[PDB]
Design a protein around this ligand. Structure first.
Ligand SMILES: *[C@@H]1O[C@H](CO)[C@@H](O)[C@H](O)[C@H]1NC(C)=O
Ligand SMILES: *[C@@H]1O[C@H](CO)[C@@H](O)[C@H](O)[C@H]1NC(C)=O
Lengths: 57, 50, 7
């Protein structure tokens, strides 16, 4: 949404681009647009859902 | 100088003019071709007259 | 949220 995706090789995070501060990737940190075919150089991993704890209510 | 991939530098330059950055990545080959064609026309433009 | 609150 604003920031950059980065990884310590094992895990994927998003950060603000002018100071390293890792955030867990979530559907409020990010926005959807279309499908994995068109983006050159995309990667997989999970995106976590902030509603999931109350999906488990 | 902090290295960054050139497609991501353009994504953050689009994000600087009120265009959501997915508009770049969904069109990257077309945007690269528009730039490559446009910079080609500069050589002919400069060649045409002093 | 409303389709998720169908749970
Ligand atoms: C990045 O660079 C190397 C060498 O050009 C290439 O093998 C690799 O596929 C490239 N990846 C992307 C996402 O362009
Ligand atoms: C992501 O995973 C799918 C299978 O779920 C696979 O087909 C695809 O090639 C993977 N993409 C990348 C960029 O690794």
């Amino acid at each position: 949404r604003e920031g950059v995706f980065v990884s310590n090789g094992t895990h994927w995070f998003v950060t603000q681009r002018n100071f390293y501060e890792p955030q867990i990737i979530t559907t409020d940190n990010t926005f959807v647009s279309g499908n994995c075919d068109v983006v050159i150089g995309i990667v997989n991993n999970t995106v976590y859902d902030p509603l999931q704890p109350e999906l488990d209510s | 100088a902090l290295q960054i991939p050139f497609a991501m530098q353009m994504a953050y330059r689009f994000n600087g003019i009120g265009v959501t950055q997915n508009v770049l990545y969904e069109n990257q080959k077309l945007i690269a071709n528009q730039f490559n064609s446009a910079i080609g026309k500069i050589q002919d433009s400069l060649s045409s007259t002093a």
